[PDB]
Amino acid sequence: GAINAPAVTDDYLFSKSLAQFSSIRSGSPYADQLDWSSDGCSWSPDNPFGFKFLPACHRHDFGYRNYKRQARFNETSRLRIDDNFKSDLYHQCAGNWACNRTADLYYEAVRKFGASLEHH
């Protein structure tokens, strides 16, 4: 109440454009049900694309943290959220080669250490 957190979570994660996700996030709707907190890829080094990648980081944390709250987090859903993150990063890069190479490092980091990144 008033929403079903899993359905809304999957809409915001996998259906909404990244820009509309950021818009929605900025107003923290349903904040008593949805976890809108994010570390904004604080686990990544400063780089020329890091600011551009910030909303992708927000959406990645949104996935992990709400799937965990919903008792839906497992290696399959973690991979789905990590793959969605790679898609978001590549969208931000818009074909820039150096940007894509940096996106690949972000994806590697969450695939390998996603189970422990928030812990750190």
What domains sit in the chain, N to C, each tagged with a CATH number? 5-117 (1.20.90.10)
d(CA 8, CA 118): 23
Torsion from C-alpha of 74, 75, 78, 83, nearest 10 degrees: -150
Of 50, 56, 64, 67, which Cα lies nearest the Cα of 114?
64
Please count the residues of the chain: 120
CA distance linking residue 55 with residue 14, whole number of Å: 14
Helix 50-69 and helix 5-14, axial crossing angle in degrees, nearest 10: 160
Å resolution of this model? 1.3
Catalytic residue among 60, 91, 119, 120: 60
Note whether 59 and 13 are within 8 A (CB): yes
User: Which residues of the chain come before a gap where C and the next N are over 2.5 Å apart?
Assistant: none
Q: What is the maximum alpha-carbon separation in the chain? A: 45
- Technique used to solve these coordinates: X-ray
Residue 119 annotated to the active site: no
Residue located via tokens 């899993």: 6
